[PDB]
Description:
Elements: E1 4-7, H1 10-20, E2 25-28, H2 43-49, E3 54-57, H3 64-72, E4 80-82, H4 102-119, H5 124-146, E5 158-161, H6 167-171, E6 179-180, H7 191-203, E7 206-212, H8 220-227, E8 230-234, H9 246-263
Parallel strand pairs: 1-2, 1-3, 3-4, 5-6, 5-7, 7-8
Helix pairs in contact: 1-4, 1-5, 4-5, 5-9
Bound molecules: nickel (II) ion.
Amino acid sequence: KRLRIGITLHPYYSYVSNIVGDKAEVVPLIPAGFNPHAYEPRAEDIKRIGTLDVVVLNGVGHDDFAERMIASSEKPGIPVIEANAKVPLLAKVVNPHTFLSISASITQVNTIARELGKLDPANAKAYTRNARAYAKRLRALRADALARLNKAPAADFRVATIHGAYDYLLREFGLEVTAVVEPAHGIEPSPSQLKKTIDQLKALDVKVIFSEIDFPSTYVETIQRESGVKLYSLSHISYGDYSAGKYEEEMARNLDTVVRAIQESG
Length: 266
Ligand code: NI
């Protein structure tokens, strides 16, 4: 009767909780504290799918584990909400970190609310109303961060990141990522690859590097020393407890750090 909705990543817990409020139950597929990049399906977690009515998926490359878990469960035909159905992607591998964008988060929130409404019509109007209030808060969060930005960065403001998570985030400043240290999503560089990346940061005069707060890497100190590139850190919104407010709290901090990096470039 009261929908039981599965989620895969922390941002989706925040989206669904804000959409449904107390009208439905939000169930994480994997426990808090586990790195979703390294998570391997456990029997205990696959069992949980059998008690759900629907699973919300990133479905564009950040939760492949969830499709495998569903296939191995008691409900392989469980309804699935493809959150990114209406989201413009980039770019050669499609970047799956659409949740680290205010505009793409609003699109995903609206898609989730519409789809949950079709599954639970008695609550369709409430889900729509809640999604619109949540989208208003996300726009305000972005406006508040931009209220601290004086100028756009100079033409020479090149940016690098350790994890390939921030292309959508930086796109909201009209900025691009020159280089990503990890050769592929969540893959540590070899010593030869890291040396080549350091050489590239120097050759292209990269100004800043955004590292990971969530599951940090031990070679970042070497990059800073060897390249002279200013270091800032961002959240993939993937560490610790699930909470309705996690997404907005950590995105506000992400946007403030990007603004600070630009402010400190001049
Ligand atoms: Ni990632």
